[PDB]
Subunit: 394 residues, 2 copies
Amino acid sequence: SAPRITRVETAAIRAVPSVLVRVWAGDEHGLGECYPSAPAAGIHHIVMNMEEQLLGEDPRDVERLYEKMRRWNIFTGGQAGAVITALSGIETALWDLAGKLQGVPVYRLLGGAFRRRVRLYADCNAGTVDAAAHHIEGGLFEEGSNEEYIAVAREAVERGFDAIKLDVDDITGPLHRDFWNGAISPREHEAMVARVAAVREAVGPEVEVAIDMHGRFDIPSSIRFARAMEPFGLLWLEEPTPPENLDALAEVRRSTSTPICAGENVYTRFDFRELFAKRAVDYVMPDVAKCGGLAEAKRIANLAELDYIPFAPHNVSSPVGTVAAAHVCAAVSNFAVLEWHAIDMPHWEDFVRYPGGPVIREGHIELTEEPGLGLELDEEAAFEHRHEGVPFFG
Amino acid sequence: SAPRITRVETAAIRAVGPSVLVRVWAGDEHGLGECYPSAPAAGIHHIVMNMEEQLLGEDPRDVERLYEKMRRWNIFTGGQAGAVITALSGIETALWDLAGKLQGVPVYRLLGGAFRRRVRLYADCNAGTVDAAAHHIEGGLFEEGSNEEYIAVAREAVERGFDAIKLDVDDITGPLHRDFWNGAISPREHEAMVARVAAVREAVGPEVEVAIDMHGRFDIPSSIRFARAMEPFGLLWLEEPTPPENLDALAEVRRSTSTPICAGENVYTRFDFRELFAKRAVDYVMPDVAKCGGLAEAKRIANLAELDYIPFAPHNVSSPVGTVAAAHVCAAVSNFAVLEWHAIDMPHWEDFVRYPGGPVIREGHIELTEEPGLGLELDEEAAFEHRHEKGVPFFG
Ligand SMILES: [Mg+2]
Ligand SMILES: [Mg+2]
């Protein structure tokens, strides 16, 4: 029927505040989500600014369409982050649209499906953190902070999960001497270990538990703290050091038996190419809605596959972004677990209408056979949660 | 008195591209900075604005501490590089300016001092051909006799007082380029390029310095074959033969020829230039102060290169505001070589700022004053006359 790109519109929903991107091929459209990065207003204008390049194009050639917007930003931050996260949502939409247009589920456009049910892992939060992921409410030198954690974990296993994840950082805490260096104090140190030890005993073994450090610390601290984690048999220790020098991560990884994980803050495929080269990790966790979309993500997984490195994507978006990734995780032979950060957000599922009923069930996500992404945004619901600048389509 | 930050405003002008202007206030006082023309100026705008809740009340004198505040503030919000970095770059400049006005000392005297007082520039002789993605408009490289048009400008620059010229040689959208996706150079497309080079060299002479940009569009084979050909013309350097992602590739090319390899306009932050210098991929380095991270960042970057005896020649595509700040840094480092000027084609470039003596540039050089904070002033008038309709609201 020779379809063509007709219009591209955005919208900002409040979740974990992500931006939705809709791409129309006449009466048809695809839906995309953009990792909640920097200001939503920003992603917005970046995405809309990509419309010219899109208009009049054929949706079925998404990979080509990707390289197009990507190379068009070479001199305007196309290696960057925001510009790419903005591209992540568009690409998803295109994938959604292409699948529906040809009438096939996205994963069949990614090489088929190695599996049809994807397993997840749930995050467990303490108080209230800010944009920099710092605890405004709660912390190491707190009180029922640990119990608060153990509780969330319990509910997580209860709700059907067998993989949990929690952070152990607090830089704006009283237990931290200086904000600028990455040093951990003797006392600050053992306080962390205890937080870990506690949850480990509560959940007992046979329950995968990963720990996040939000890349705040220095070489010595990271190393010290990592050896400490060894007797706990963690699924992994996330970003011990700052995301900018991968050589440091490698040095840390190389220093202990505890497995290392990162990827959340590395963008293009070219960058993971370097991450892998430095043998910097045991597990890779890129974010589909943030790194460049499903296509980019599959590649990254393919690269890791050559080294027998497990693929466990980072995900902190609505049911949309989450399903986008589910599709990727299904066409990748070396997938491990997909992240879920919504144990604390009751309305999460109201953002979309999924076939079976809920998206998540028994700790997994059961992908269907419907055409492309197989979703349906509930517009009144989404509006009921719209972030309030980024216009809601109209 | 305890100056604290009080207000942060933006504004998008029309330089070589829509560029966000940043103004920071600490009471009656303010500092001025200019962002690099990245993506939609609106995005740069918002990013900058979203940054205000982090500055209010801060002592704008500990500038470096504030960059790290915002940079680190953006760990999980695209702060590793690109847009967010170009944005902060503007805000950084402002503060570095504000601070100088407060302490009452020119900026270079805050960056460790000056090695030289007047900085030499180089003229890009492809300024008006500008495509948002660096592609060449209405024809490109080959055509009737473009070589003529280029020699005209080359000479126009020498006359203008310059002794350093920059030229393009890529026409990916031209009739002589077989495919837009691979980066192969055809037999005839190749001769076309060398022709452009030869034509300009024979015209201007051997003492004028000429560098050539490839806008990083080619594969290993083409880059290498073209580089080996650039050897006889004694170029100043050859800019980005391969795409800006893989530096190992850029390094592989550099080991290939005797033609000097230069790069750096597409890499942000000290952390990334470290890897660059690590791979020994450049003969020259050229980050962009209004894009990479700020004067401070740019100085660190120069220092890293100094270690390896590598020349520092920043990429410049901004108005008098960004441009001058760039010279402050050019002054505070021993390995400075040449700063870029990309406005030979726009008559009102100077009408944006009121500069101490007469104009800013004078005979291919920029002389620096002892006037606190940069030493320049926004001709609010001209500024607004050339505002940008698309949408970032002016200073109010
Ligand atoms: Mg994380
Ligand atoms: Mg260039």
